[PDB]
Amino acid sequence: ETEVQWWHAMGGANGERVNKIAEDFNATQSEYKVVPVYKGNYTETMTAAIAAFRAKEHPQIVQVFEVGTATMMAAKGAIYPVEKLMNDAGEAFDGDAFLPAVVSYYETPEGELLSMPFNSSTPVMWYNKTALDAAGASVPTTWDEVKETAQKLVDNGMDCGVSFGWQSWVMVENFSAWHNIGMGTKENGFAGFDTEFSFNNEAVAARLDGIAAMSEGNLFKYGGRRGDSLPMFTNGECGMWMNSSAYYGSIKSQAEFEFGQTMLPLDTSVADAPQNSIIGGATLWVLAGHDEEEYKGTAQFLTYLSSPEVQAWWHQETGYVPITTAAYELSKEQGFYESNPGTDTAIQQLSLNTPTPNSRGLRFGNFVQVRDVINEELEAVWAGDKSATDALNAAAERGNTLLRKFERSAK
Numbered sequence: 388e389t390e391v392q393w394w395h396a397m398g399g400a401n402g403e404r405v406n407k408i409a410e411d412f413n414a415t416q417s418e419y420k421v422v423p424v425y426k427g428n429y430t431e432t433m434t435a436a437i438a439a440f441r442a443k444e445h446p447q448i449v450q451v452f453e454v455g456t457a458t459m460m461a462a463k464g465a466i467y468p469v470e471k472l473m474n475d476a477g478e479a480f481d482g483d484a485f486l487p488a489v490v491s492y493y494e495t496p497e498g499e500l501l502s503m504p505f506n507s508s509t510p511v512m513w514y515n516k517t518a519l520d521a522a523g524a525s526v527p528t529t530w531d532e533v534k535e536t537a538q539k540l541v542d543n544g545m546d547c548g549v550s551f552g553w554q555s556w557v558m559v560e561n562f563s564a565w566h567n568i569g570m571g572t573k574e575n576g577f578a579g580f581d582t583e584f585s586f587n588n589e590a591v592a593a594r595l596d597g598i599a600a601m602s603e604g605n606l607f608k609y610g611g612r613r614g615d616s617l618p619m620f621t622n623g624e625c626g627m628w629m630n631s632s633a634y635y636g637s638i639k640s641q642a643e644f645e646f647g648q649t650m651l652p653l654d655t656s657v658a659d660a661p662q663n664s665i666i667g668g669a670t671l672w673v674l675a676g677h678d679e680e681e682y683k684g685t686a687q688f689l690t691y692l693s694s695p696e697v698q699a700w701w702h703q704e705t706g707y708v709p710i711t712t713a714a715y716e717l718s719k720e721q722g723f724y725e726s727n728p729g730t731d732t733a734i735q736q737l738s739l740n741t742p743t744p745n746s747r748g749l750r751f752g753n754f755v756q757v758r759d760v761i762n763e764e765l766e767a768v769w770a771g772d773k774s775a776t777d778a779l780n781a782a783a784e785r786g787n788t789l790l791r792k793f794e795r796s797a798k
């Protein structure tokens with residue numbers, strides 16, 4: 388058998404599902420063996436695959452999160468464009484089958500998808516319904532209601548009211564799209580490499596300062612980067628938790644309480660109504676430099692991932708959105724949204740309203756490094772070392788230096 392190495396960043400419950408998907412494909416035919424290899428978080432996985440390339444130890448497939456997309460698109464010569472791979476191997480590829488938000492996020496300016504959609508997400512408001520009921524609180528729709536609900540929870544003995552993971556994705560990037568304000572110039576990077584950051588504005592700063600003020604009395608508690616704060620939610624310590632829809636699998640198996648999810652809170656001091664939310668998660672990039680049989684097996688595996696049945700199963704088990712309209716309709720016909728209430732929140736929120744350039748998503752080179760900058764500066768806010776205005780200004784300044792580095796190399 389010819390081996391197809393797939394380097395990915397899926398840990399926990401969702402990583403076990405990756406292993407089940409790979410092995411199910413392996414069991415259906417006898418020519419190709421997909422070998423999934425966990426390489427760490429998204430940054431570590433991307434970094435490892437790129438570093439392995441010139442050592443010729445790189446995988447056939449690498450999962451690269453949305454953050455890394457501009458960098459991967461500029462890495463011409465390192466990637467095998469998926470549409471070319473599939474045609475070369477005799478496998479179908481129909482980009483129009485994917486959700487419009489996915490296509491618009493990942494297509495080149497010429498309308499091509501270079502990578503294979505797989506695990507797309509958006510952040511949702513997770514909540515502990517059991518704790519809300521005990522506190523006489525209601526599921527919030529606005530930021531005022533978030534604070535009031537947090538107060539009721541902590542008054543009723545909850546360790547803390549609200550927290551969030553992936554804080555830049557949640558409270559800067561999605562917060563901006565949700566309120567139709569720009570994250571950077573040149574349509575959040577889609578219209579040019581001469582972009583600069585725009586999130587250092589009063590609307591974002593005022594909300595971050597309001598959250599920081601909630602640390603007193605434990606209405607808010609910071610719980611670290613990425614998904615580090617997941618056990619604060621699943622242990623029953625915090626009653627509200629904003630993070631990826633893709634924590635559904637983990638929450639469903641680890642939470643001893645009744646849980647739900649709803650759309651992100653609206654900051655009514657910024658907008659009268661929400662816009663839409665934006666993509667997280669990853670796509671699958673096929674790397675150059677391998678042989679024909681390895682690419683044939685790669686393409687056949689991507690076909691296996693292209694089926695509505697596998698796409699619906701992945702969405703149902705993880706909380707990543709159904710990546711095609713067909714997978715969504717299959718899940719609906721299966722009664723999944725009736726039997727598992729709230730699991731259509733993420734797909735609805737991505738497409739809540741006709742998008743604007745501010746709600747399409749983001750496309751910034753060197754955004755892996757910018758993400759560290761923004762997380763560091765937000766941590767300064769929660770620690771009380773900086774105001775949100777100063778921290779966002781520093782994040783934008785430091786981020787712009789990285790955008791300029793990318794622009795200088797990308798010509």
Ligand SMILES: O=P(O)(O)OC[C@@H](O)CO
Nearest residue numbers: 508553556631633667668
């Ligand atoms: O949806 P997940 O896979 O948790 O990833 C969130 C990450 O893409 C935010 O940048």
